[PDB]
Ligand binder design. Sequence first.
Ligand SMILES: *[C@@H]1O[C@H](CO)[C@@H](O[C@@H]2O[C@H](CO)[C@@H](O[C@@H]3O[C@H](CO[C@H]4O[C@H](CO)[C@@H](O)[C@H](O)[C@@H]4O[C@@H]4O[C@H](CO)[C@@H](O)[C@H](O)[C@H]4NC(C)=O)[C@@H](O)[C@H](O[C@H]4O[C@H](CO)[C@@H](O)[C@H](O)[C@@H]4O[C@@H]4O[C@H](CO)[C@@H](O)[C@H](O)[C@H]4NC(C)=O)[C@@H]3O)[C@H](O)[C@H]2NC(C)=O)[C@H](O)[C@H]1NC(C)=O
Ligand code: NAG
Ligand code: NAG
Length: 273
Amino acid sequence: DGRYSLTYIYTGLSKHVEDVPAFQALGSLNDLQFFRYNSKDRKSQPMGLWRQVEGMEDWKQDSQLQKAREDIFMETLKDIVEYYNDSNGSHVLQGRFGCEIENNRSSGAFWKYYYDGKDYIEFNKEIPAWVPFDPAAQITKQKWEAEPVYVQRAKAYLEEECPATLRKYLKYSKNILDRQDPPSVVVTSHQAPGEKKKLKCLAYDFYPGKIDVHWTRAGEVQEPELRGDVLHNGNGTYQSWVVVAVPPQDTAPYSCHVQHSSLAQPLVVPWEA
Ligand SMILES: *[C@@H]1O[C@H](CO)[C@@H](O[C@@H]2O[C@H](CO)[C@@H](O[C@@H]3O[C@H](CO[C@H]4O[C@H](CO)[C@@H](O)[C@H](O)[C@@H]4O[C@@H]4O[C@H](CO)[C@@H](O)[C@H](O)[C@H]4NC(C)=O)[C@@H](O)[C@H](O[C@H]4O[C@H](CO)[C@@H](O)[C@H](O)[C@@H]4O[C@@H]4O[C@H](CO)[C@@H](O)[C@H](O)[C@H]4NC(C)=O)[C@@H]3O)[C@H](O)[C@H]2NC(C)=O)[C@H](O)[C@H]1NC(C)=O
Ligand SMILES: *[C@@H]1O[C@H](CO)[C@@H](O)[C@H](O)[C@H]1NC(C)=O
Ligand SMILES: *[C@@H]1O[C@H](CO)[C@@H](O)[C@H](O)[C@H]1NC(C)=O
């Protein structure tokens, strides 16, 4: 088949305000987020299109898995902070890990951490072993490879467990991930006195995100003055817009051109001056 990826992002704060949960976890399949979890509610909740999907995962049991990871992740953050002697400062530890398959064949995986935005430590499953980037990561590298077993386990997760889990979610998610929802396009305009007229083209409610939206002046592609696009996760749809500035006297016709995988033919919307 095609490419599919399973991704997780853990974020921990040494010091956080009351609303703000100290630990936050989120998972994604391709471009969409299918679940979340935070240190406050301590609950693994499905998201977007998966909110209606049942049997894919035991959210109760996963909530326990996260609670575990949390304790561990946060403790690591604790140690690091201790190293730099700033136990009472605001710091962040971010973990990102996952795998991906292409043609039903494992095609990669990763596991990396970021302390305060900087690269901290990263796992190389081909060695297998961790790679330090930050001085403290050396201590952490130490601990994490204390027993020969550890590195083996890590390699296993990425090469075995992760992909396995990806496989199962696919059984419940392929559809969501495979959608070919065409974009609706709308042309709009703005005009302030003493300024060039601005034409805006908006493509929306489409999926996948890959799309081509551009303006043409009498048939010649026009470089946009402003671009912009968004993903609405709970929804599963994208929105991409482009704005051109049309000179005062210009009479050349302006049309918006939208190309997308779900469309057999490019969609063209002219601007009726
Ligand atoms: C996923 O989740 C998304 C976000 O959570 C959500 O976003 C919202 O998407 C809808 C479209 O799906 C969008 O709606 C507006 O629709 C305008 C056209 O209306 C059509 O269609 C509606 C129903 O779809 C009908 O009720 C109308 O009658 C009308 O029908 C058309 O009627 C004409 C007659 O003249 C016929 O010729 C047509 O054939 C007929 N078509 C159809 C299909 O029936 C559209 O023009 C709106 O454009 C917006 O963007 C322009 C440029 O930015 C603005 O100038 C314009 O004012 C609109 O701005 C919105 O204004 C709001 C209030 O100020 C803002 O809060 C919004 O942020 C702003 N939206 C945008 C995109 O800028 C517009 O498309 C909503 O606007 C959009 N809202 C947001 C916040 O994104 C999706 O719907 C969800 N999709 C799914 C599948 O679940
Ligand atoms: C932390 O403070 C101690 C004692 O002042 C100092 O020796 C050490 O270098 C500091 N640790 C780091 C990682 O800078
Ligand atoms: C994906 O690969 C696994 C292992 O080779 C296999 O069990 C499964 O049937 C494959 N899926 C498809 C759709 O072929």
